[PDB]
Design a protein around this ligand. Structure first.
Ligand SMILES: Nc1ncnc2c1ncn2[C@@H]1O[C@H](CSCC[C@H](N)C(=O)O)[C@@H](O)[C@H]1O
Lengths: 199, 385, 79, 408
């Protein structure tokens, strides 16, 4: 890498990242074609700005298309790039796409624990509790250990919705991981058991 | 399925990639899996606009949705690559067609000749035409036009005569594209006797209207305000077979005009093509890059494009002024800087702006001029002989 | 193997869950490779030898041993 | 054909334990100028579960309850012995090391106790790296006023305890334990540098213990250990277990994590050593300039949650840099390269401002350590401590330079 190439990449990546943060996926596409005209090869961080720009404007199809451009260019997506797509999929309730992206990160040899934690919280936040339980249990049964904050989140939200079957499954997996249930978790299960008519 | 495929074919025909992308997104947003033919129309549109990255994404997405490419899909790529001279990517399709069980038809051979020609591989272009006849087949009219362009490009006056006269030996009435290539090879060798001999043939042309008008306008008879409407009338009629035929017509026409000394007329002909959508990648003018893309143009068309681009540069600052002569996988190699287009553009730039445009150390097919050197810069004379 | 069983039970809090875990692991062996068990190699013996080897010690697979002085086929050692 | 083709410790070191049911598997005790260590005598292949490396019987240990009341396991102090009154007069929170030191000195006086034999393999007063043995000149080489004041209070507390409990009127069975202050200071130094605190179940009683465990106090510390300690309640044996699935090469040192999550100043206060690759060391920044936490972690392939950072140049210092550098994060907002370069430049200036506080540099300290010929163990420990901090600050400057360029 010469000094002239480094100088151009700085001003090209300055313009590109100032439009990704501006939530302008169209502008981020123009700069990439400016890089191609100059002969500069867009790296993983240039397509990251394209994914983020689409992701910030709630655009799941364009962000997935941007990922295909990155893969089609032979570049390796950053771990943060996949997390932006995983978090976007959860916000739209697309658990199937969120799980497909997690499989890609495992294929890319990344660490999917943090991205799996993000996917479950997005589904819970966006009132997709049924989808969140499916994703959470698959990760928990797969061997991943969730955060204590997320364990308390999943148990409590299921019991507020009257879903004792999922809340009991999670609490069993929580102890199998090595986190013992406390009075808080039992009080969540009892909130549903007390209404079943069988004392 | 019938309405989606019908519209996308029109977008691919006319090279409206933006509309094609929205139809694809509309289908996906309605949980509709587009057919293998629908994607081929989208792939066609991107190749019309020289958007190879977006074309190969659609080709990749065909296998993702199970809409495996048909024989027509491998032709949309070949013609898209042929215009850009991407014979490296053309051989990938050819090496894939033999493995996919698809025999080489005539259309595959035409793209191979066109790709090698635009890529500067003259020896390999005629070899394909040599190997084509061994495999029997039946060369069509475009195949004769495909091989005539090879001989016309490498200044073969006697070979071009034999090829051209044999075209009318079967009473075929060769199209205006072949006539413009005759004028180039005669104009390159300064054979002014043969130029006037062919022009009189195009001046009468009681059967074909396009030859008459185009032949008349080359000599300068139709360069009036009211007399340029007839020339535009022919251009609008030809602007109905899509961008695929248009790019071939304007490449030959600009090549003929430049070698005949009608360099100012070539400037206005190129200005007529751009407003009709021909050469959509030709110019970019933003704060970052001022670029001219000539990898899909003929030598005469490239000189006209550079001449206008240089003159417009002196009128006005971007971070870089670039000339895109090679646009493909050949860039990341030393062969791109040895391409005939790259050498011709650099040689043209050397004796017009002195040593202001130098090669790039990171790309073989680029000719750059830094912002600092743009300060130390009509520049090109555009006159009719 | 008697000493190995006592060795494994020193690392176990409850001997009844140890028995269940061994049986659960033995069931997995038979589903994975049905034809290799029931004769000279017993699945429960394979589990115990594997768990001793997991501690870093060395034992023959499934504790299977044979008489090298058998005078050919058809002859059974008589007790 | 076969015809055509660190010193080992005293053999009696392992034998005295071996005749008392100490077992070591695939490891050997080796001795060097810096002290004892445990090394894999062969290639320890990975298994599905943790492999047993060493087994130490309970009866060879000196343990005391962490929490009041003070009970000893095994109970070696006779009823009515005056040493219990000395142990019972200690501060329950702070004086755990004094209680272990009294037990340690008492154990040396017992004819049948194992530590009468094992005590001869403990580092002497001029060989132990504990800062309790450091002179005022050794503390002058720390270049850390907070640590120096902490050590001075430790030395003051230890000395005053001896003067109070080992005066002229005490019985002879007490006098002969610590005839001089230096003898008791050495015992407290052994107690601090070698105590292992674990939750154990003995019979039906579960309790926290401060334990002096022979042959396990020879394991050196690592923040990425290949071994861990495991109490086996059923037969009262401490197990040293190598990590499950981890292959250990012949000659590789066997290590445990003495103090998870602790900085070098804590390692110096307790064990009298520091590491340049401590992943918990911190550096005081102003916070005016911040870098992108997500970018920094991904550039160096640091994954996991902040409290469990790991690397898939990068070592514990870069992980420590991620935790101590001023960082910003906005979910998935990308960082502007030109604004990040200003932060990296300003962070490097502040890193050099702190290196300029030290009269010498890291390589000058390293060559000083090589030039030593009559230096106390604590003097070299003090120099290694300040040198490690300089190496950590220098590592941050290099990491920021790499991060600034890999952001293009
Ligand atoms: N990683 C490390 N780097 C430097 N010294 C270490 C160390 N881990 C342990 N030590 C030293 O070892 C002592 C703990 S007892 C460990 C065995 C000791 N080396 C001996 O020969 O007795 C501490 O006082 C410390 O000085």
């Amino acid at each position: 890498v010469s000094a002239l190439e480094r100088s151009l990449r700085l001003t090209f990546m300055d313009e590109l990242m100032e439009r990704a943060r501006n939530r302008d996926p169209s502008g981020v596409s123009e700069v990439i074609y400016d890089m191609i005209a100059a002969g500069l090869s867009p790296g993983p961080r240039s397509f990251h700005g394209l994914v983020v720009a689409h992701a910030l404007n709630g655009d799941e199809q364009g962000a997935m298309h941007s990922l295909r451009k990155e893969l089609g260019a032979g570049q390796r997506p950053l771990p943060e790039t996949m997390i932006a797509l995983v978090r976007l999929s959860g916000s739209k309730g697309n658990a199937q796409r969120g799980l497909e992206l997690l499989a890609a990160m495992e294929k890319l040899n990344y660490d999917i624990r943090q991205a799996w934690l993000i996917l479950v919280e997005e589904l819970v936040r966006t009132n997709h509790l049924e989808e969140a339980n499916k994703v959470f249990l698959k990760g928990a049964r797969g061997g991943m250990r969730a955060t204590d904050q997320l364990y308390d989140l999943m148990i409590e939200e299921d019991c507020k919705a009257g879903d004792h079957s999922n809340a009991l499954d999670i609490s069993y997996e929580m102890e199998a991981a090595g986190r013992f249930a406390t009075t808080f978790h039992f009080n969540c299960l009892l909130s549903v058991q007390a209404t079943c008519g069988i004392p | 399925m019938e309405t989606y495929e019908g519209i996308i074919f029109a977008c691919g025909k006319g090279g409206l990639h933006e509309d094609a992308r929205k139809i694809l997104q509309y289908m996906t947003a309605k949980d509709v899996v587009p057919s293998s033919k629908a994607y081929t129309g989208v792939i066609e549109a991107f190749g019309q606009a020289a958007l190879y990255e977006e074309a190969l994404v659609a080709f990749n997405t065909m296998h993702e949705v199970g809409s495996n490419p048909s024989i027509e899909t491998f032709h949309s790529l070949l013609y898209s690559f042929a215009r850009g001279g991407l014979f490296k990517e053309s051989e990938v399709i050819l090496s894939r067609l033999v493995n996919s069980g698809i025999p080489r038809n005539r259309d595959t051979f035409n793209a191979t000749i066109e790709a090698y020609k635009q890529g500067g591989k003259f020896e390999e272009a005629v070899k394909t035409y040599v190997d084509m006849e061994k495999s029997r087949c039946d060369p069509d009219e475009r195949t004769l036009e495909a091989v005539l362009s090879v001989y016309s490009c490498a200044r073969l006056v006697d070979e071009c005569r034999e090829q051209f006269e044999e075209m009318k030996a079967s009473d075929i009435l060769p199209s205006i594209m072949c006539y413009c290539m005759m004028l180039s090879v005669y104009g390159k060798t300064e054979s002014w006797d043969d130029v006037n001999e062919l022009l009189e043939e195009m001046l009468s042309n009681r059967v074909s209207n396009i030859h008459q008008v185009i032949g008349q306008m080359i000599k300068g008879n139709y360069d009036d305000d009211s007399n340029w409407q007839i020339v535009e009338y022919v251009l609008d009629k030809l602007n109905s077979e899509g961008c695929g035929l248009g790019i071939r017509f304007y490449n030959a026409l600009l090549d003929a005009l430049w070698w005949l000394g009608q360099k100012e007329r070539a400037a206005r002909v190129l200005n007529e093509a751009t407003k009709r959508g021909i050469f959509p990648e030709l110019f970019r003018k933003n704060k970052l890059v001022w670029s001219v893309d000539v990898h899909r143009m003929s030598e005469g068309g490239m000189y006209t494009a550079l001449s206008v681009w240089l003159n417009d540069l002196s009128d006005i600052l971007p971070q870089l002024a670039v000339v895109v002569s090679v646009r493909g996988q050949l860039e990341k190699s030393s062969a791109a800087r040895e391409s005939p287009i790259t050498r011709a553009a650099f040689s043209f730039l050397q004796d017009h702006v002195s040593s202001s445009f130098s090669f790039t150390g990171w790309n073989g097919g680029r000719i750059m001029c830094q912002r600092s050197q743009l300060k130390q810069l009509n520049i090109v004379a555009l006159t009719n002989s | 193997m008697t000493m190995d069983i006592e060795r494994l039970l020193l690392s176990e809090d409850n001997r009844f869950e140890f028995v269940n875990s061994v049986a659960a692991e033995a069931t997995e062996y038979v589903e994975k490779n049905r034809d290799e068990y029931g004769g000279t190699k017993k699945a429960i013996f394979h589990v115990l030898s594997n768990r001793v080897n997991d501690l870093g010690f060395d034992r023959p697979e499934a504790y299977a041993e044979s008489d090298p002085y058998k005078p050919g086929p058809g002859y059974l050692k008589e007790y | 054909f076969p015809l055509f083709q660190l010193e080992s410790a005293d053999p009696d070191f392992y034998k005295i334990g071996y005749v008392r049911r100490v077992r070591a598997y695939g490891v050997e005790f080796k001795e060097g100028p810096d002290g004892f260590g445990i090394y894999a005598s062969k290639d320890i292949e990975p298994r599905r579960r943790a492999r047993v490396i060493m087994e130490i019987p309970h009866e060879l240990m000196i343990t005391i309850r962490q929490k009041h009341p003070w009970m000893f396991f095994p109970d070696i102090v006779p009823i009515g012995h005056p040493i219990f009154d000395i142990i019972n007069s200690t501060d329950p929170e702070r004086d755990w090391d004094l209680r272990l030191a009294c037990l340690l000195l008492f154990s040396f006086d017992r004819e049948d106790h194992f530590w009468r034999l094992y005590g001869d393999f403990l580092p002497a007063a001029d060989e132990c790296s504990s800062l309790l043995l450091a002179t005022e000149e050794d503390l002058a080489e720390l270049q850390d006023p907070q640590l120096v004041s902490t050590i001075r209070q430790q030395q003051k507390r230890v000395l005053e305890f001896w003067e109070k409990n080992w005066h002229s009127g005490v019985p002879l069975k007490i006098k002969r334990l610590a005839e001089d202050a230096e003898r008791f200071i050495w015992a407290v130094s052994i107690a601090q540098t070698r105590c292992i605190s674990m939750k154990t179940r003995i019979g039906a009683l579960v309790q926290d213990l401060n334990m002096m465990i022979p042959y396990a106090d020879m394991l050196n510390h690592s923040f990425e250990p290949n071994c861990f300690l495991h109490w086996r309640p059923k037969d009262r044996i401490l197990e040293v277990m190598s990590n499950a699935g981890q292959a250990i090469k012949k000659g590789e040192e066997m290590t445990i994590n003495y103090m998870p999550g602790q900085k070098n100043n804590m390692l110096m206060e307790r064990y009298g050593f520091s590491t340049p690759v401590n992943p918990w060391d911190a550096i005081p920044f102003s916070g005016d300039s911040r870098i992108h936490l997500n970018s920094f972690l991904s550039v160096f392939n640091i994954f996991g949650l902040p409290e469990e950072y790991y690397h898939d140049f990068v070592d514990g210092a870069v992980i420590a840099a991620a935790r101590t550098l001023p960082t910003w994060s906005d979910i998935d907002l990308p960082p502007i390269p030109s604004a990040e370069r200003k932060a990296v430049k300003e962070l490097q200036d502040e890193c050099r401002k702190m290196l300029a506080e030290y009269p010498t540099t890291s390589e000058q300290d390293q060559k000083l350590l090589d030039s030593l010929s009559e230096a106390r163990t604590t003097f070299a420990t003090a120099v290694k401590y300040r040198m490690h901090r300089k190496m950590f600050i220098g590592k941050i400057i290099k990491a920021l330079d790499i991060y600034q360029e890999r952001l293009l």
